[PDB]
mmCIF file of C-alpha atoms in Angstrom:
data_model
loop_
_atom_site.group_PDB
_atom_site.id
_atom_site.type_symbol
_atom_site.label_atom_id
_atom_site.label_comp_id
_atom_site.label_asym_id
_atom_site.label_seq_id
_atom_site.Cartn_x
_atom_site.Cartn_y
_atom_site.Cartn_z
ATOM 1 C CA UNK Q 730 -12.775 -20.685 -4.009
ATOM 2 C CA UNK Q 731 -13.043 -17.339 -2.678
ATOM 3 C CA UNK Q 732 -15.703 -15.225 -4.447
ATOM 4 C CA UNK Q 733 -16.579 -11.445 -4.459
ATOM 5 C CA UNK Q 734 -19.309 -11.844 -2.162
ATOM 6 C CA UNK Q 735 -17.326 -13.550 0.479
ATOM 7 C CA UNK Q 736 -14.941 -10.382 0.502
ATOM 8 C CA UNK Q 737 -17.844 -7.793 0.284
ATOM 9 C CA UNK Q 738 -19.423 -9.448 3.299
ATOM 10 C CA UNK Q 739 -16.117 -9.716 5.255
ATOM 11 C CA UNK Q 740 -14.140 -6.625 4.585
ATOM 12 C CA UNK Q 741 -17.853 -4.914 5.303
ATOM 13 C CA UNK Q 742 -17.517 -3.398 1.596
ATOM 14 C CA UNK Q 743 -20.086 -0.927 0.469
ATOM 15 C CA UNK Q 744 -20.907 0.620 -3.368
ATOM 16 C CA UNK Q 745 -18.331 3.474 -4.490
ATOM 17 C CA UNK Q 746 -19.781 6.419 -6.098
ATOM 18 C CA UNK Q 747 -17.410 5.920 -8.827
ATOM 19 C CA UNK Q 748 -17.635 2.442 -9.546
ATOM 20 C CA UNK Q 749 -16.636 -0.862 -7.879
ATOM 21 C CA UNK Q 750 -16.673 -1.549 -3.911
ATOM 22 C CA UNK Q 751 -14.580 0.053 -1.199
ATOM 23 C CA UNK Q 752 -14.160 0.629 2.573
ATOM 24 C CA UNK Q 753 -12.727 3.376 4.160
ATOM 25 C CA UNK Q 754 -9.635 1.689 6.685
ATOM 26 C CA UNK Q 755 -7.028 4.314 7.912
ATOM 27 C CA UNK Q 756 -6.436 7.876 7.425
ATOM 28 C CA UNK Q 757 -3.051 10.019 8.731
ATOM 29 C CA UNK Q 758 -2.891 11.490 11.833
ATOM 30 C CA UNK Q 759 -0.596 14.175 10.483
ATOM 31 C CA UNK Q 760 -1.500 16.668 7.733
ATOM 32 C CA UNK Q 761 0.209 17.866 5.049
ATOM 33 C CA UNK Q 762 0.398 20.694 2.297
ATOM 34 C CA UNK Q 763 -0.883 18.936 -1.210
ATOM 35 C CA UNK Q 764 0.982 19.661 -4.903
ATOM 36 C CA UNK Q 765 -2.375 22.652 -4.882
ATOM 37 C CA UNK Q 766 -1.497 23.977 -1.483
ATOM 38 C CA UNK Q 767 -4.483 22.788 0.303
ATOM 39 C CA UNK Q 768 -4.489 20.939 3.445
ATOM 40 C CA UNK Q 769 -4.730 17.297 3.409
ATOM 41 C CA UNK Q 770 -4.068 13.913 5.317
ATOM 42 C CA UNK Q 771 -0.531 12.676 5.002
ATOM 43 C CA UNK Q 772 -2.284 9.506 3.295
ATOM 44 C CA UNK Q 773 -5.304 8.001 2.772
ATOM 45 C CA UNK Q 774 -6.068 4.619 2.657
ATOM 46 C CA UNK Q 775 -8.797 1.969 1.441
ATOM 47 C CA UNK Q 776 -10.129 -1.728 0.185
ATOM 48 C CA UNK Q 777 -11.317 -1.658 -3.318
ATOM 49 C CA UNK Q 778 -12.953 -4.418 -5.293
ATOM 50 C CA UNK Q 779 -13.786 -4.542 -8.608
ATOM 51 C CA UNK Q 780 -16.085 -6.935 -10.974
ATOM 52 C CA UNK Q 781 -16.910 -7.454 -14.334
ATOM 53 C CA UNK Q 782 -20.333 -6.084 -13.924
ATOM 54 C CA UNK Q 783 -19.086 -3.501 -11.487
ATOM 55 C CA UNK Q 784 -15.828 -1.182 -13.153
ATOM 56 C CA UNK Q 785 -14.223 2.366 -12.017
ATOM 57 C CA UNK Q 786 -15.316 5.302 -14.137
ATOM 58 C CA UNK Q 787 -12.629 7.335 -15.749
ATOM 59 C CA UNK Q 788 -11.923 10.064 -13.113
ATOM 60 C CA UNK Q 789 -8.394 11.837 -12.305
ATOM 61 C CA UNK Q 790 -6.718 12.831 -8.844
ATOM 62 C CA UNK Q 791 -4.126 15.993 -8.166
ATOM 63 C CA UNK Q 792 -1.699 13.582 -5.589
ATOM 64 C CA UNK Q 793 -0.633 10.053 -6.461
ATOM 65 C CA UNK Q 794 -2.555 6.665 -5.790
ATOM 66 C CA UNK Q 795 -0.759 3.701 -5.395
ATOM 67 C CA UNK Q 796 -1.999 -0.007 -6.046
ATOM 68 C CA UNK Q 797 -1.894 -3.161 -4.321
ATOM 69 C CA UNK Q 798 -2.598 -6.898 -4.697
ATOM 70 C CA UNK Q 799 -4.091 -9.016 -2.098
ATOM 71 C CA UNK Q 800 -7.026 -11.563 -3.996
ATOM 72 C CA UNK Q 801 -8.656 -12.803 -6.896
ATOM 73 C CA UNK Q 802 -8.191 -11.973 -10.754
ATOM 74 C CA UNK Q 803 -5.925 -9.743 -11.938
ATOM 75 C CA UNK Q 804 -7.425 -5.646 -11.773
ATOM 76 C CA UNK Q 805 -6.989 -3.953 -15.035
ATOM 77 C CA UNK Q 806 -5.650 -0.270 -14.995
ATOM 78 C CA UNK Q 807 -6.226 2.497 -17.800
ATOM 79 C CA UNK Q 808 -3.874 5.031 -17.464
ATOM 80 C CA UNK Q 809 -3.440 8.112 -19.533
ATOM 81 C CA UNK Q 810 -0.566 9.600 -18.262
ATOM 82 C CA UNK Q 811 -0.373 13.788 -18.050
ATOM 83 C CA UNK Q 812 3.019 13.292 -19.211
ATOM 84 C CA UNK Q 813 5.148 10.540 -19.546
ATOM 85 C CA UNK Q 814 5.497 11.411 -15.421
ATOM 86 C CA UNK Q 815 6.300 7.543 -14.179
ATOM 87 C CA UNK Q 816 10.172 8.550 -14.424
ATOM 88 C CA UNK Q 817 9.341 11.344 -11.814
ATOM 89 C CA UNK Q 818 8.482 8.600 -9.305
ATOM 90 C CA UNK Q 819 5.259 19.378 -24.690
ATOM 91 C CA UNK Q 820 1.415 18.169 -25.526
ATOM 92 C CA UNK Q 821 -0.475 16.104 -22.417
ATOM 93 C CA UNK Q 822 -2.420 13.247 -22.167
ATOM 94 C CA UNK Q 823 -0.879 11.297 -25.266
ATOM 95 C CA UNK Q 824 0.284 8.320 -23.868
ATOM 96 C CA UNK Q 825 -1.909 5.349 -22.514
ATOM 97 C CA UNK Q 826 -0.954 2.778 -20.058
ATOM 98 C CA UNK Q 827 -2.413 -0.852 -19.205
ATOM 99 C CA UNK Q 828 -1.535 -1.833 -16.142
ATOM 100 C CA UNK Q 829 -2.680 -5.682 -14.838
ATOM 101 C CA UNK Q 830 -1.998 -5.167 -10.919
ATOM 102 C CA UNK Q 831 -1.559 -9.304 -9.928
ATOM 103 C CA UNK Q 832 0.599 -11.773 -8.474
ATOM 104 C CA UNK Q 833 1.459 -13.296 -11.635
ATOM 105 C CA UNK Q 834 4.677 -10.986 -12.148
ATOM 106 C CA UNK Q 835 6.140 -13.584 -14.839
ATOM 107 C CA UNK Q 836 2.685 -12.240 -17.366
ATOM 108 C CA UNK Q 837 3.815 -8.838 -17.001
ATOM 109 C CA UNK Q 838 1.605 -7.966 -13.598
ATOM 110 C CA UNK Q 839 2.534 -6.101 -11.125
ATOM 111 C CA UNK Q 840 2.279 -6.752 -7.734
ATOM 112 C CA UNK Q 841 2.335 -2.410 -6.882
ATOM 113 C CA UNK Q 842 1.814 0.077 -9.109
ATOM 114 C CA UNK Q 843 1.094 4.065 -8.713
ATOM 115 C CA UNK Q 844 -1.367 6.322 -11.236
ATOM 116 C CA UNK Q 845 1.006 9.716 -10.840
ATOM 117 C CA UNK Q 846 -1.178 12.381 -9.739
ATOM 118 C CA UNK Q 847 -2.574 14.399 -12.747
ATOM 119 C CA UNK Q 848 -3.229 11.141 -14.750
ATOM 120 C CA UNK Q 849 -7.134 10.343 -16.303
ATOM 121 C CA UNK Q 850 -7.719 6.624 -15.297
ATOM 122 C CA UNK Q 851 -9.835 3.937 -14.197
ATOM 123 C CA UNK Q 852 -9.986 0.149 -13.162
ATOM 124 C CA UNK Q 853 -11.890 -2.960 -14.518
ATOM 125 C CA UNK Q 854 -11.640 -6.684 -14.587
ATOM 126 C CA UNK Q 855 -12.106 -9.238 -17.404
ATOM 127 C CA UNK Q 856 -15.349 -11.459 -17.334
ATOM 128 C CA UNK Q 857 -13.663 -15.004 -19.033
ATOM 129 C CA UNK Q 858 -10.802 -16.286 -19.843
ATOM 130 C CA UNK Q 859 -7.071 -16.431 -17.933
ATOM 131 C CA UNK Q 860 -7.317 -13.101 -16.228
ATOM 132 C CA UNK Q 861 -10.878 -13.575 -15.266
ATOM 133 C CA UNK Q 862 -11.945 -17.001 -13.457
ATOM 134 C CA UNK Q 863 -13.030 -15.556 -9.707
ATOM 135 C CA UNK Q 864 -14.924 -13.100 -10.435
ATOM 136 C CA UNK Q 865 -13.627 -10.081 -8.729
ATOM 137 C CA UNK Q 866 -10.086 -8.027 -7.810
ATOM 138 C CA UNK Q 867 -9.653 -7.285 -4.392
ATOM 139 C CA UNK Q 868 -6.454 -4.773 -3.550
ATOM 140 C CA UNK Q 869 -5.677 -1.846 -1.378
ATOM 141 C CA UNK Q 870 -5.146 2.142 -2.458
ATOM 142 C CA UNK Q 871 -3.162 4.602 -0.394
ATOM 143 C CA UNK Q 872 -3.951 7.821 -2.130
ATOM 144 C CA UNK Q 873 -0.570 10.567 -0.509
ATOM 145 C CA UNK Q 874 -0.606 13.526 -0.126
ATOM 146 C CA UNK Q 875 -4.253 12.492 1.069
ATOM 147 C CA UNK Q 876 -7.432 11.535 -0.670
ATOM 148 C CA UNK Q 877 -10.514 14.444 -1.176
ATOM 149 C CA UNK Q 878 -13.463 13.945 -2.950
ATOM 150 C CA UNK Q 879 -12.912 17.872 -3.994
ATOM 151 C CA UNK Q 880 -10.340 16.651 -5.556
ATOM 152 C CA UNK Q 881 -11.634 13.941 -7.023
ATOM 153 C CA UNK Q 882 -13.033 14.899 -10.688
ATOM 154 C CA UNK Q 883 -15.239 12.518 -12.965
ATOM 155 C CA UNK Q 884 -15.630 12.553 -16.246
ATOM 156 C CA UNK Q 885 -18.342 12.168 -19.191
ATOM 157 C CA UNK Q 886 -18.030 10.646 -22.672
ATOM 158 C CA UNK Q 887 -18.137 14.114 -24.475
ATOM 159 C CA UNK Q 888 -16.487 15.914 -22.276
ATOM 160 C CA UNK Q 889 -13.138 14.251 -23.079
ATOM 161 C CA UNK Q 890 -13.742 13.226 -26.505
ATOM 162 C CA UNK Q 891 -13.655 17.446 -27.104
ATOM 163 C CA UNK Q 892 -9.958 17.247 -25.354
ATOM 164 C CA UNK Q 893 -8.499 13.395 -26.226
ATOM 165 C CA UNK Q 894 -10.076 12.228 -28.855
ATOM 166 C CA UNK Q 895 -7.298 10.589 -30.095
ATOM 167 C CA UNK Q 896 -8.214 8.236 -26.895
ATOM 168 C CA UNK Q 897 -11.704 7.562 -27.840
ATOM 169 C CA UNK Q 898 -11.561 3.895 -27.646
ATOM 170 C CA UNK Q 899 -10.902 3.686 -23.652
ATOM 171 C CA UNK Q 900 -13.196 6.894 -23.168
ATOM 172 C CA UNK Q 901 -16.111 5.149 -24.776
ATOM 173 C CA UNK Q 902 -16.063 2.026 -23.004
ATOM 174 C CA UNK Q 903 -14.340 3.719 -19.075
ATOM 175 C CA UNK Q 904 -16.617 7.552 -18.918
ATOM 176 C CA UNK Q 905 -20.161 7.893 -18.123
ATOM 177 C CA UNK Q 906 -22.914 8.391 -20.688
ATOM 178 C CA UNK E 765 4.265 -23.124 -5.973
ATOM 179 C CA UNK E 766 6.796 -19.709 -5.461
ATOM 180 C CA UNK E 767 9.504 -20.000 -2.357
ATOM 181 C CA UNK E 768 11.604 -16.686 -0.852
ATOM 182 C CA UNK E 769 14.168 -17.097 -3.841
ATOM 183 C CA UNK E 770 11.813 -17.054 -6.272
ATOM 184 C CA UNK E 771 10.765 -13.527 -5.446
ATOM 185 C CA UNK E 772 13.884 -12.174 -4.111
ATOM 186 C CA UNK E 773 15.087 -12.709 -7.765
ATOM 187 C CA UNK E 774 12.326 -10.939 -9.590
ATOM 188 C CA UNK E 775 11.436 -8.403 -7.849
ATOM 189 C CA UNK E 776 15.618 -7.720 -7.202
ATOM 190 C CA UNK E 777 15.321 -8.166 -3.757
ATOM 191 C CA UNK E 778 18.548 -7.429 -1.484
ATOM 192 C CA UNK E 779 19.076 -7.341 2.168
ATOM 193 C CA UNK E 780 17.519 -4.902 4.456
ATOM 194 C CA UNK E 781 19.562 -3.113 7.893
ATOM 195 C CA UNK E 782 16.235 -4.365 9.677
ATOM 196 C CA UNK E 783 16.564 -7.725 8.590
ATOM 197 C CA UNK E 784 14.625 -9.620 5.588
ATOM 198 C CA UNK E 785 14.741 -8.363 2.032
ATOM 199 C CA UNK E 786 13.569 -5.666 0.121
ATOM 200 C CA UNK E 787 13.955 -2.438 -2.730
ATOM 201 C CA UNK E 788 12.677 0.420 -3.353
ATOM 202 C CA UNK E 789 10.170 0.988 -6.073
ATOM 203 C CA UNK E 790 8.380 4.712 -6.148
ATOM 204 C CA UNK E 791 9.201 7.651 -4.469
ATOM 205 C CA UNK E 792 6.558 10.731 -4.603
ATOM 206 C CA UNK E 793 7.752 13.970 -7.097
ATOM 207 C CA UNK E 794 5.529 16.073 -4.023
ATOM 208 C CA UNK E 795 7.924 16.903 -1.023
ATOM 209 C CA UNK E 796 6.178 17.418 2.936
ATOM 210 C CA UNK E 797 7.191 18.440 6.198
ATOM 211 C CA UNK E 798 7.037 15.352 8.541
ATOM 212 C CA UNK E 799 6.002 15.268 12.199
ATOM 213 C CA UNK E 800 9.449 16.824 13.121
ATOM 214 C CA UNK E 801 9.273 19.790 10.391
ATOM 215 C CA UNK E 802 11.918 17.748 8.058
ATOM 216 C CA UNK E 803 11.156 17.905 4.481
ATOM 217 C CA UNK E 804 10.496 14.325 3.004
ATOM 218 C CA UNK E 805 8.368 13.372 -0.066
ATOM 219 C CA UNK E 806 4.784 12.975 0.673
ATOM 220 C CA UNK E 807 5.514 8.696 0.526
ATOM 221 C CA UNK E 808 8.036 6.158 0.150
ATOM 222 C CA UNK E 809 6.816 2.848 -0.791
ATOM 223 C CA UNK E 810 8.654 -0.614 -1.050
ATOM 224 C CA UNK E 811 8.564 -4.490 -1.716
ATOM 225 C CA UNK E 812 9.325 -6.299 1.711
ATOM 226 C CA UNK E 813 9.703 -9.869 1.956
ATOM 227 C CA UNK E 814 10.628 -11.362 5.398
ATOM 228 C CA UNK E 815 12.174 -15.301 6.277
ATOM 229 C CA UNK E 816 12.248 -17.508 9.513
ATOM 230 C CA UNK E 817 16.042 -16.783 8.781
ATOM 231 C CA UNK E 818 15.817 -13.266 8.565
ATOM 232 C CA UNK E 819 13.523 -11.307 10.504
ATOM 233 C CA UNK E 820 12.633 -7.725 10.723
ATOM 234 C CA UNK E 821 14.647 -6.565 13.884
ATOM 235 C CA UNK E 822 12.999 -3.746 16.509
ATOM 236 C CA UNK E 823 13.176 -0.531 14.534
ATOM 237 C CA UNK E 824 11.801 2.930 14.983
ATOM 238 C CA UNK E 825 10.144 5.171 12.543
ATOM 239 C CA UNK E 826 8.739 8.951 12.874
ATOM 240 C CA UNK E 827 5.951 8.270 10.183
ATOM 241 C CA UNK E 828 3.469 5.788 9.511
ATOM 242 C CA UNK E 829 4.000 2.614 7.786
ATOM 243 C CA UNK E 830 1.149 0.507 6.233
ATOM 244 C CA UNK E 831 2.276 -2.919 5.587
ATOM 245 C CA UNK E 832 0.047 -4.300 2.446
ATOM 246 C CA UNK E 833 -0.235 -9.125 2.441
ATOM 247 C CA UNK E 834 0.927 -10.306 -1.680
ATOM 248 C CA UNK E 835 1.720 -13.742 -1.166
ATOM 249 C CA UNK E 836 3.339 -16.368 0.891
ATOM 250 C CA UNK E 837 2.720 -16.674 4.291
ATOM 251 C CA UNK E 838 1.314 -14.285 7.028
ATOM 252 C CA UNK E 839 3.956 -11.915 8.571
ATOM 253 C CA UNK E 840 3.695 -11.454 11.885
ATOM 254 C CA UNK E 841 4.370 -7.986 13.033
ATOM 255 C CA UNK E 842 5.347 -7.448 16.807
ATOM 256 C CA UNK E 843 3.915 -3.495 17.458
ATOM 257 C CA UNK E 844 5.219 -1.614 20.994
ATOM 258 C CA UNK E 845 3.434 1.474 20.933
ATOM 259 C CA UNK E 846 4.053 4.522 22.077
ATOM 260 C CA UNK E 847 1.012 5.152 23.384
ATOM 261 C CA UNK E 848 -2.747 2.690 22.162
ATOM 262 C CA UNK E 849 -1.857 4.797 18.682
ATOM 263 C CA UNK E 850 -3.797 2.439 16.550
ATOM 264 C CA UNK E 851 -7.484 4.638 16.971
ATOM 265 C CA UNK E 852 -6.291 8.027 16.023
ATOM 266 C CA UNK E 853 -5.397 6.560 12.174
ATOM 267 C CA UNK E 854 1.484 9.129 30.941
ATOM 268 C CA UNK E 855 3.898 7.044 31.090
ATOM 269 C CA UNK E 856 5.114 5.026 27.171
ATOM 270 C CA UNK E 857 5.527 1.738 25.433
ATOM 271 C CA UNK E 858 3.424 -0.457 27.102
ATOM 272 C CA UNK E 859 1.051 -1.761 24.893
ATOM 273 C CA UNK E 860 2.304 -4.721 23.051
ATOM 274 C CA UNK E 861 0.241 -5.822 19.852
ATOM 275 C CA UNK E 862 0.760 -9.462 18.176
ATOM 276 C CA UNK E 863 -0.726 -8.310 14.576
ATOM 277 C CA UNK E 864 -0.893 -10.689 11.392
ATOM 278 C CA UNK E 865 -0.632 -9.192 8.219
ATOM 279 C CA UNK E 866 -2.377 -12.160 5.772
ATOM 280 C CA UNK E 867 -5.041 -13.390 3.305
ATOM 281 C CA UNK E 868 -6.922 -15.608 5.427
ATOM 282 C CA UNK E 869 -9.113 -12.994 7.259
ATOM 283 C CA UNK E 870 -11.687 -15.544 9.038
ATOM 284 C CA UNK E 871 -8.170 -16.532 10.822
ATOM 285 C CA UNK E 872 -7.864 -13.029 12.266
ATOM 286 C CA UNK E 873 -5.303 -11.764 9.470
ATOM 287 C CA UNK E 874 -5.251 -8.214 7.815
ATOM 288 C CA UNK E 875 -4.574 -7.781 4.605
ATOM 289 C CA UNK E 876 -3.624 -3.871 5.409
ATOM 290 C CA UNK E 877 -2.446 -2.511 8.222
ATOM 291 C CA UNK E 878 -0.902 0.375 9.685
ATOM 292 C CA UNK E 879 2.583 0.995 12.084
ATOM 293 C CA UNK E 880 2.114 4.191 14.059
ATOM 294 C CA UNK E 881 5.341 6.541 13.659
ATOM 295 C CA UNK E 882 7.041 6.414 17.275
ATOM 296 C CA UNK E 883 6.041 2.708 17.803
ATOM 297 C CA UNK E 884 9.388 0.192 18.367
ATOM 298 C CA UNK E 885 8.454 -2.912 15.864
ATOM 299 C CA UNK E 886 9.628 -5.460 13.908
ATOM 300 C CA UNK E 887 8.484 -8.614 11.923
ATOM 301 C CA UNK E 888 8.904 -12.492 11.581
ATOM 302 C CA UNK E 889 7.541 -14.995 9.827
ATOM 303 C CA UNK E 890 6.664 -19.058 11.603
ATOM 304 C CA UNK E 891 8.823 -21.948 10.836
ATOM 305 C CA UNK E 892 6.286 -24.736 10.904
ATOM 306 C CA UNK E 893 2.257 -25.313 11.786
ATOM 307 C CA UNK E 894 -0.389 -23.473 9.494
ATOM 308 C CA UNK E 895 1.236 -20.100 9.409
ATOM 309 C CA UNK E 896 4.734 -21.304 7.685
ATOM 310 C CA UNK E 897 4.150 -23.124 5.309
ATOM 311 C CA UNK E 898 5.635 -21.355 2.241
ATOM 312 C CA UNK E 899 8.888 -20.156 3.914
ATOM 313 C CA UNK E 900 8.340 -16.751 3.052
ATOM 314 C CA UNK E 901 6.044 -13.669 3.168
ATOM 315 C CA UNK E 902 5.875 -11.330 0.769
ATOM 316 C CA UNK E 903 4.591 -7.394 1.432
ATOM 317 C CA UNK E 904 4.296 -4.181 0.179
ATOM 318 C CA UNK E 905 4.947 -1.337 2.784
ATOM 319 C CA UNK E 906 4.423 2.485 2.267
ATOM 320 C CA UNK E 907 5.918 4.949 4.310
ATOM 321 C CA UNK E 908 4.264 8.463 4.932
ATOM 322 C CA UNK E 909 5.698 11.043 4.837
ATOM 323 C CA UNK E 910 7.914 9.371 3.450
ATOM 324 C CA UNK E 911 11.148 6.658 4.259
ATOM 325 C CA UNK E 912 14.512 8.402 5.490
ATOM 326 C CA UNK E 913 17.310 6.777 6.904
ATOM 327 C CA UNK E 914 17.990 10.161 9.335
ATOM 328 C CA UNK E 915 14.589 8.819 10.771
ATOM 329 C CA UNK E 916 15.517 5.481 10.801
ATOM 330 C CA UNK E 917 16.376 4.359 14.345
ATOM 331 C CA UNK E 918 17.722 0.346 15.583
ATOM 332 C CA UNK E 919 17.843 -1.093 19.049
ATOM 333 C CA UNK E 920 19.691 -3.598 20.775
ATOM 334 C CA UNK E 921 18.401 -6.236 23.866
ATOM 335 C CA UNK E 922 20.986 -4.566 26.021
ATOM 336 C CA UNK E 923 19.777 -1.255 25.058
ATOM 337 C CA UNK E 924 16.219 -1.749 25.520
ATOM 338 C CA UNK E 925 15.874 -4.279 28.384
ATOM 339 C CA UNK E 926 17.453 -0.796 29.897
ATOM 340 C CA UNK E 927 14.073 1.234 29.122
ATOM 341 C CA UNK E 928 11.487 -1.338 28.743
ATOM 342 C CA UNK E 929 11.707 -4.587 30.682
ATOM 343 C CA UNK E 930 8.265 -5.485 30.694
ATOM 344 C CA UNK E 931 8.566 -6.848 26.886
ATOM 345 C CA UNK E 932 11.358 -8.844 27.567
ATOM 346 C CA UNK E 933 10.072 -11.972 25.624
ATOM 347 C CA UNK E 934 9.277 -9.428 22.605
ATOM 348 C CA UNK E 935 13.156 -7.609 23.415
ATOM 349 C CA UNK E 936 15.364 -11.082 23.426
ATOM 350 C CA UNK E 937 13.058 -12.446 20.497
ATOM 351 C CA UNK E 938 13.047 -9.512 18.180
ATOM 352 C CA UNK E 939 16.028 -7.302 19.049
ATOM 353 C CA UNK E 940 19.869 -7.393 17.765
ATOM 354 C CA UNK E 941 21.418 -9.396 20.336
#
């Protein structure tokens, strides 16, 4: 009954750069040496929603970002991994990962999930059928060792078909033109 | 519709010191000093799912801890703060905050929010009226830097109707009798 505008309007959600919507909510008071040695928060965290209309760019981080379910459909994850690095918590980038982040954990969702720092990936959300009926995915990230937009690096079509091509189904339809 | 067992089965679910029910499910590869110069990894995160039967007794962190709403009912947390520690994310504890952590945000409920490390808290979930309904709540919670048990501090009524007084309904309600 709940629809993406009623969550835009009430979580006071603005356009991400990126892709989607988000809101800032809490960031740590402490600090705290990242895996590149700079200086960040302890954790980040925000409100992301995704629609159909409205997806995450592919885009990869240097700390980990973890998931969470709160409303709506189900948000699809694309995850290539650097390496097989989910064990954690030799060629890179060969493995891909779907990940449906839901509440449906008997379909294979999950309810948490974390992208392991060092991983190309981005978020979407189907338009019909079973995993797409409300219109929207509404969760929570907590980006730790904290979130930086320096850190933050976006991608283009051509830029990683040159490096993954083997990939080039998920890079044509999740980079930038 | 889902009920505590339900979830405590497939999710593996087992009993927590605290109270309620929980496991562990990523740990960050990236270690931090903490607010007391202890080396911890950067988060800790974990399923937490709470009962009219079994509550989350007063506990004590030294980090963070944002509690994330998946299902259920809303869980109530019952926050003593250090000191009104809630903006930066002289004598102590006196600020005592009823928070709901739920889905139903026109009701006052937050689906995300964050324990300040120092603050005594703990969490419970309503028998009857419109917030138990369901028997159960379900939550993610993240701790950063990250979940230690050498960090991990328990009261007693006794103990704290010794320090604190002026929370006595909060104390006899919520702590280890």
């Amino acid at each position: 009954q709940n629809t993406a505008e009623f969550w835009i309007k009430r979580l006071q959600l603005v356009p991400h750069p990126e892709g989607g919507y988000y809101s800032e909510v809490v960031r740590s008071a402490h600090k705290v040496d990242n895996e590149e040695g700079n200086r960040r928060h302890a954790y980040t965290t925000i409100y992301f929603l995704c629609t159909p209309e409205s997806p995450s760019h592919l885009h990869r981080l240097c700390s980990d970002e973890t998931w969470m379910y709160h409303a709506g459909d189900p948000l699809q994850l694309h995850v290539i991994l650097k390496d097989p690095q989910d064990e954690d918590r030799r060629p890179k980038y060969q493995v891909y990962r779907r990940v449906l982040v839901g509440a449906r954990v008997e379909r294979g969702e999950l309810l948490q999930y974390t992208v392991p720092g060092g991983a190309i990936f981005g978020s979407s959300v189907a338009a019909d059928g079973a995993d797409g009926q409300a219109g929207y995915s509404l969760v929570s990230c907590i980006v730790s060792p904290g979130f930086d937009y320096r850190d933050f690096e976006i991608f283009t079509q051509a830029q990683l078909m040159e490096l993954y091509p083997q990939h080039e189904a998920v890079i044509k339809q999740m980079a930038y033109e």
